[PDB]
Design a protein around this ligand. Structure first.
Ligand SMILES: NC(=O)c1ccc[n+]([C@@H]2O[C@H](COP(=O)([O-])OP(=O)(O)OC[C@H]3O[C@@H](n4cnc5c(N)ncnc54)[C@H](O)[C@@H]3O)[C@@H](O)[C@H]2O)c1
Ligand SMILES: NC(=O)c1ccc[n+]([C@@H]2O[C@H](COP(=O)([O-])OP(=O)(O)OC[C@H]3O[C@@H](n4cnc5c(N)ncnc54)[C@H](O)[C@@H]3O)[C@@H](O)[C@H]2O)c1
Ligand SMILES: [Mg+2]
Ligand SMILES: [Mg+2]
Ligand SMILES: [Mg+2]
Lengths: 368, 365, 373, 368, 373
């Protein structure tokens, strides 16, 4: 079949839904790959690189959408693309349908078959396509937080690791899941004193074992959180579940002046009461005497790393969908089936259907 | 004696030349400490912190300068401050006289006694008061490198440590001195693959032992240096300056690669370096991003103030207890910082860089 | 029952399939242990050692095979042993059937019941009897690869760890399971720059955590594999699909692009090799040239460290040996799904699906020979 | 020559001034080694071990002192041994003569030639025979600190390393010399959060590099020291001339109830205002709501370790005294010569001479 | 001046005493560089590479030696080269004179001026030109020890690192200087249990700090050394007294009490060997039996990794080469006391005190040869 990857069109979205490794593998299996000219430029993949791997490069967005049987993207389609959606095409991308009725309705009205990266889920409950984006966000949180700690950025003016004889930044990571663990490991590699809070004591055991106690772990109670947050130079909100609000504005009021709060959970409401999504040009805002950083889609800022991280994870699903079509691919792999979102006007996600007050169609009935 | 610390007035300078630790020790010893109100605020030290330690908080800069026998600062006096300079006061601060005849003329015309932090020098040749600033600047170079590597900052789009299955940033540190060692260490801690270039094999050998081979060391031939730089996502120039990275070497670098010049305070070690500000920290050179902001340590004044004043403390105490002449006689390292006294220039290097007469430090001791 | 252990006969095979502690235990449970005289000498276990444990020592290999109900070995039967294979005997050893149409034929034609160590597989997917041998083979691969990088061995002439100011060897390990992890670990301990590829990203996460990113990890696509192999001084092939012949991942064409004097150690040679140019070699003559590189393809690597590997192996196999001796193959396999996955041949039936389909031989369901009545 | 080693006779001194290794090296060079029957049994050295190495075992202390040309000891001669001192013998042991007029006078009255372990000193200023004992004391201080932190010993009841989710002990080490570095190292290996205070920034740089930021370092000032001590569960005093009083009883008053303070400097006055030397059986006492541990001669607690650490250090010096006699050995080795204390009624240490108000005889005048 | 670099002639010696960038630097300074055709081939430096850099390629060894004012070599001249030694030439190379009366006599009888790399010595006592080779040899000692511990090499058959549940190899390193530290470090990286002995307790403290006690340290006395060696699978001899013949610390009767199949690598063989039974072996025939033990005694170990060792060496030597070329030996030694410490022979005088003491030969004070007029 024909696999199409258009240029991402969201403001500041520089990732692309495939790399040449991926193109080469599809091509080797007798799939034709159609890529819009310039699609990989944000990720430092040239048209030449993609063509060498086997792709046909196409001038236009609508030719890619009109000719592909499988359409790969990174983000959900936006308004300018709604008219490009079609019956008989499989769309595989991050969808976040609960967050957009316009998107969901555009997909339902088009008749298209869509599968969401973020709800693909293995039997142990893990989200293997979301996982690499959580790793990158976690790692970025630490770097971005160190930088905004600079006084020239409105921060308290504290270097992460201090220097001999001088106190390091005190870093608090809320959440020991994927993002959280990654934020802590990098803030620790920068010499900061890192404390991670979680109510999952097994996750705290893993940290304790992996850094041999260097990363502090505390059982997360409201009481312990308040105390840790009042002492912090840097707070990283890394709770994945809507995200609960663990840091009240009352609490922020008692923080050290110039403390930085980095909200990774922003892609689901934020885990700070005061969080509201930001953009790259205006990344941070003040709450009380404190600095909030809440940019949406953090991994888009490092496209060369994120493109590879995302697509290395999606590749085996991409291959199964190309080889076997959506129905058979979903029937063979219940993890892939958990991502099924729409098909010929049916909404196949019970979570989205109940959030939106839309009829739910059971996935099982469409796979027969 | 009275020790006086005014607020720093240079644009974007937020450090302060003493902490509460230093005031308590001066006070313990019977000296009076006078500090301009608000002086510690850029460094997150409040007036109340200073007062609890023993300081007297005075309302104006003019009063601090008038009444101090020993005047501690971070940066050289600027034009607005020239009228405050006075005979019979010891000024102790970073001066960099060879970079400013105006400042030199001001100190000479004032008759003041001054000692430069940066030329205080121990017998092994080390500069103990610059050292903490090089430590800070090396660590920052890693953090700031990492941030401008983001595509949104106009860098290539590479995360320092990558993630499992994905290539980390390739980081090259040129120079294995204090700053370089510190840049290498932070960048390695962030997960980047780090290569240090230097022609002192002994320093390479200490980096190899310290990190068990994890930080790569290459002896700095022209072939090694060019190959390393062309493969790099991030270059930290840390040679304390000669121009090691030519503009045409930069032409062959990966698009969107970041070059951070720590040497910028001494001309920079990249051909294309010119000094840059916090508001506009980077500029393009070919398809590459140069970061050359001056006084990097000023960015983290809570850290830098303590790093610096921990280093100056023993000298401050000796100046306070014994006065500049007795302290300088007892400690030749401190004497190496002598700059002016009662109209006379005491530095041969500054005198010859400015083509001005020079009084041998030994004259006055 | 009578359990028998013959002397290993494979080239330079110094391992044995039981130790004195094993014989004492079998003996204590009232079994007769028969051992071919000399069998343990390669592992420094003397006949007196084995006899004091409760074993009857036997002059001939033929007698051990004829008298044993359960026959324990380390390696697969070789050509000179095909005539010793018996109907109604249990053979418990490393088989690697997918790699040998001829060995499979002899087992099938003999009517024997065979269970392979390397397909014994627990619920979590782990291969507990292969594991210790993959640990040894992977550690060996790094030292053997380092040794062959020496110019005096025909290799490139590069030191594993370099020295200060001078680059280390670039080591590419394909596979991040037991063998690859151990190869990567030892190579990294010797100072090399180690990159590990796998298609299982969780294995790459584990390595990334264990060495805090010091050992590099790359998702294994053909595109990424070739780039890495072209840059490598030493390549270690360590991939597995359990019971299946190795996929050919490194083409002779790719090897033609490698640095002269590069070394390729194919640990997966026991399952047929994961390099196109791999063919089984021997401790006596372990290497051969392909294009301007040197291949190392020894299919019994742990044989050269028998004081380590005899014990590592028997620590793992002995609990399964005991179940087989006490209860017989069928009952033991019924009680333990993990042992059952090892089932390979019975009375001319091939019980392994991957082997069957890799060899183009008809397959018989294992459940059909274990079904209750 | 004849080298004699008697049994240590001070209360609770279980160390011995030679090991089998040392005996074998002396014996191989043609020296005769005479050892009091039972001398190494505190250090787990049987008479058989010494005998096998070439020693001659003798029944009585009297015989060892009478026949030895070089007498090796661990501690200074006590009152009962004063009559065993003699003209023409070399005595080589820890002397601390300034702390004892009775010992000093005994050495002088007897005419013996004595050399003090603790004043042997290389040209970088290091004290190589004292160094091993500081290493031991420092490491022990971490272990005894841990033990007396148990509530059952009167301490606050805090485990060094905590456990996942739970806060570790906060340990403050005052001084980054040999003892302090060693205490910081063990206390950190036990999982504690360790802060080291020193005014030597290059010693702090070394800690920062050796443990990669894990052991915190703070520039030492009374102000920093007060703050650190007020947060500590355990304070180790490791300042190495008499030791300065760095922790006042007033500061102790503001400490956490049940905090433990271990004074390694006790063998030169202690560095806590409240310190006074203790013994193994009554090792601790209360100051305000705090527990002080002040046992003199901590390395005696682990004679197997300490015997070997010490005699490894002294061995090259012993070999030279034996091969060459005291005069030639001292002329050739200025480090050994610095240990020179007495000879034929002359007092050869200027510090001891001025401290006791005795005539000072120049070591050079005797070395000619 | 004419600086000449002949091809190395020692067994399996693949290093060369200069690289193309060394040649360009001399040629830039106005010196003529003569290189024996083929001299760089073992280090993959072609005649063309050298010619490109500015060298004159000459066909015979004899012409290089006859024409060169400064003669750069890696190893000491051997018997076939003794006739090439010249009065009025400076020879700069590894000499190891305390270990060869024959080589010393040849240098003395020829009247040549020789400077040893291994006795050039900075005021801190470091030997900056030996160091890189010691790093290479120490790292190699670990990998060749591990190799010969294999049963297929006549070794004991123990894996360096063991595997979980099974004990690793027991490695003793004698000497905690450059080579000892590097061998301990690589052995430890392979998973071995490593014990290092030295009489310098400060070198033990460095090892203790660096590996937080993981590498064991023991003060070196005869008694400790014989306990440690009796328990060893592998012993690495790495002691030095600068310019002196190595002490024999490991007696043949001690070797008699070692484990059967133990491996002893004498890195110090270049200065005579620190084992009683040691004698120079070759990369062709590196081992021989002492009692039930295998001795390894290669005196040019870094020759096998020339891509690493040629650059490591020349990185260190080249600054001294430049000063010798520019100013002649006498002026250069006068300006640089470190280089002066290397001075070994001049016009029939032996300038090295330790060598003179060790060979029982008259010593001439080097300051006499450097005196002003
Ligand atoms: N030669 C010998 O003496 C000897 C001894 C022991 C083991 N071995 C062999 O070593 C091999 C490895 O064994 P193991 O115990 O490490 O297995 P393992 O299952 O633990 O790991 C094998 C890994 O290979 C990976 N893999 C499979 N296909 C891949 C591909 N196409 N690209 C990249 N990675 C891929 C898997 O994801 C898995 O992680 C086996 O063949 C085993 O029999 C040989
Ligand atoms: N075989 C080769 O190819 C080759 C190559 C390079 C170096 N080397 C040799 O390796 C040897 C060691 O060199 P290095 O650079 O490590 O030297 P080094 O000086 O750095 O270290 C030598 C160490 O040996 C210790 N030592 C001396 N006498 C001792 C004794 N009696 N007992 C225990 N320890 C003792 C010293 O205290 C010192 O720490 C030298 O002979 C050198 O020439 C050999
Ligand atoms: Mg398929
Ligand atoms: Mg002597
Ligand atoms: Mg010159």
């Amino acid at each position: 079949m024909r696999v199409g990857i258009p240029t991402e069109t969201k403001n500041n979205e520089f990732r692309v839904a495939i790399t040449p490794a991926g193109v080469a593998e599809l091509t080797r299996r007798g799939h034709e790959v159609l890529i819009q000219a310039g699609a990989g430029e944000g990720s430092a993949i040239t048209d030449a690189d993609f063509k060498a791997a086997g792709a046909q490069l196409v001038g236009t967005a609508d030719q890619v959408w009109a000719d592909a049987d499988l359409l790969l993207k990174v983000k959900e389609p936006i308004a300018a693309e709604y008219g490009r959606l079609r019956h008989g095409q499989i769309l595989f991308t991050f969808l976040h349908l609960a967050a957009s009725r316009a998107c969901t309705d555009a997909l339902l009205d088009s008749g298209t078959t869509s599968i969401a990266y973020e709800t693909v889920q293995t039997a142990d409950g893990a989200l293997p396509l979301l996982a690499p984006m959580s790793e990158v966000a976690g790692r970025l949180a630490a770097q971005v937080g160190a930088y905004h700690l600079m006084r020239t950025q409105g921060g308290r003016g504290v270097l992460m690791g201090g220097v001999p004889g001088v106190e390091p930044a005190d870093v608090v990571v809320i959440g020991a899941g994927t993002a959280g663990y990654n934020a802590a490991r990098i803030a620790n590699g920068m010499g900061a004193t890192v404390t991670v809070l979680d109510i999952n004591i097994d996750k705290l055991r893993q940290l304790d074992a992996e850094f041999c106690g260097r990363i502090h772990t505390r059982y997360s109670s409201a009481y312990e959180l308040e105390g840790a947050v009042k002492r912090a130079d840097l707070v990283i909100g890394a709770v994945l579940v809507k995200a609960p609000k663990l840091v009240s504005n009352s609490l922020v009021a008692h923080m050290k002046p110039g403390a930085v709060l980095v909200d990774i959970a922003i892609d689901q409401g934020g885990c700070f009461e005061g969080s509201r999504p930001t953009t790259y040009d205006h990344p941070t805002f003040a709450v009380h005497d404190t600095l909030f950083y809440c940019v949406a889609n953090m991994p888009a800022s490092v496209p060369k790393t994120s493109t590879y991280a995302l697509t290395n994870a999606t590749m085996p699903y991409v291959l199964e969908l190309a080889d076997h079509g959506w129905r058979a691919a979903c029937r063979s792999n219940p993890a892939l089936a958990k991502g099924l979102s729409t098909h010929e006007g049916a909404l196949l996600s019970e979570r989205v259907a109940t959030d939106l007050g839309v009829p739910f169609t059971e996935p099982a009935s469409v796979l027969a």
